[PDB]
Amino acid sequence: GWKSKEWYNIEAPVYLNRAIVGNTMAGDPSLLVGRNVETTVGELTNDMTKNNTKVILRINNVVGDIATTDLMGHELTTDYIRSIVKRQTSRIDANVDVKTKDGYVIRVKPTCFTIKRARSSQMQAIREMMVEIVKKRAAESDFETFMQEAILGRLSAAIYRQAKFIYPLRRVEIRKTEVETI
Amino acid sequence: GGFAAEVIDVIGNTGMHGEASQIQCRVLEGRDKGRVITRNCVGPVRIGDILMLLETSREAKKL
Amino acid sequence: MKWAVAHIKSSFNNTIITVTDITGAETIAKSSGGMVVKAARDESSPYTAMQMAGQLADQLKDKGINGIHIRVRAPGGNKQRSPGPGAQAAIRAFARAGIRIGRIEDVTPVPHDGTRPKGGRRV
Amino acid sequence: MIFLYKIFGKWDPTEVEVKDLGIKRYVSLTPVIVPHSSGKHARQQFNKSEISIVERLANNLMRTETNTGKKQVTLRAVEEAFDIVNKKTKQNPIQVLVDAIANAGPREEVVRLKYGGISVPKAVDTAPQRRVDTALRYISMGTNAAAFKSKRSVAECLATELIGAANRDTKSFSINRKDAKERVAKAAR
Ligand SMILES: [Mg+2]
Secondary structure, three states: OOOOOEEEEEEOOHHHOOOOOOEEEEOOHHHHOOOEEEEEHHHHOOOOOOOOEEEEEEEEEEEOOEEEEEEEEEEEOHHHHHHHOOOOOOOEOOOEEEEOOOOOEEEEEEEEEOOOOOOHHHHHHHHHHHHHHHHHHHHHOOHHHHHHHHHHOHHHHHHHHHHOOOOOOOEEEEEEEEEOOO | OOOEEEEEEEOOOEOOOOEEEEEEEEEEEOOOOOEEEEEEEEOOOOOOOEEEOOOOOOOOOOO | OOEEEEEEEEOOOOEEEEEEOOOOOOEEEEEOHHHHOOOHHHOOOHHHHHHHHHHHHHHHHHHOOOEEEEEEEOOOOOOOOOOOOHHHHHHHHHHHOOOEEEEEEEOOOOOOOOOOOOOOOOO | OOOOOOEOOOEOOOOOOOOOHHHHOOOOOOOOOOOOOOOOOOOOOOHHHHOOHHHHHHHOOOOOOOOOOOHHHHHHHHHHHHHHHHHHOOOOHHHHHHHHHHHHOOOEEEEEEOOOOOOEEEEEEEOHHHHHHHHHHHHHHHHHHHHOOOOOOHHHHHHHHHHHHHOOOOOOHHHHHHHHHHHHHHHOO
């Protein structure tokens, strides 16, 4: 059983320096086709700063002893998400699907927080500007650059500097970035 | 392994009718010397007793 | 350098543990509370959790893995939500077994408003 | 001066080293000319920490109802058992006894703790004084049980018990009771 099933390695996206993640062993070469690899931004680029987010990677083809993987979005951890949420901070949840330059469709869920208990009207304005800014990021930037801004945190700071005028946002994140198309 | 440890202080007592107590011995009788392991000891427990365990990995929780 | 992930379903009645690779579609070692211990009343104990972690660490060493992340979960949802006592006991027993531990995540499935929570209130 | 005191004028407790390192600081090898110190166990507790061990083993041998007030016959049985252990099992006899105590003294014991919402005793470490007391109690029980209803003398059965619990003979009552209590402690970890 264990001896018969051989071993394989992994290969990260090219835009993440084609990095190495881990090794997964299966009985056959085609068995790793369609297998999600859950790893964090920190381990993909050996830095402890970006650890609260785990990236999602999908196998696309086994190039010999190496399994190339597709970055199918990220998602903030449950504990960190529940830690950011506090009292008197009306978190502006949202959900938008967009089309990048490459034609990828990404269902992004950008979230917002406020220093005080934000009114409903300001929350609606923040959500509308958030959806519009995410649309402009997807339209004006391709898949890899926009998702680097999103996962690495450029998109959150961009939302902070583009949507702070209506109300002081305590903190902004992009908790879910599920990927639909290619 | 049958490692040991010596009672360096007595936190108090533990149990319903007195019984044992809470002791933080220092494990100095094995490969894992330098570890202070909280444990409960029944009887007239005293400071400096070289109490020898059958397993010293476990530690009694905080009361 | 082989990296694995151990799944710990800790409950108030049992603390089943299974160990998989990074992709998760292949399991390496597995052992529940009653798998090694014959008392259902003691299947959820921290001592049983350390026994399970010890009996999984040697199989991990045989397979060739020395470090595992921890994805601890309660039953979650319409049942017990918080993690049981076996999680920290299993992780500490793994670390005392020589197997290195990196990230440990509490990944109990939390429902916003799921199905109807079965309960008797006072009973 | 200290005139090199030996137990009953025969066995000096100075030239004996303890095996169980925790029990060394409680079981006393202090030289006393006679095992009738008549201890003072009321000023505090654990007043036996400075008392001799031959006296303590002779006064834990009066478990029986008729044995109360009979420290003389207990010392007689102690002396003849020491003679038997020295003869058939040639060695330092108090060394054999201290090995027996360190081997048949309960390392672990189970005590009731109502944690987890269940009536369950928890397995705990045993105190050195408590462990020495239980070792002496089980030695007395084995001696009394063998010596009752038997063709073998009290001191002969005590010597058999000491040889059983000293050389790790599995047939001794003290060894079997210590293993039984440790098994019950393992059952309720
Ligand atoms: Mg009812």
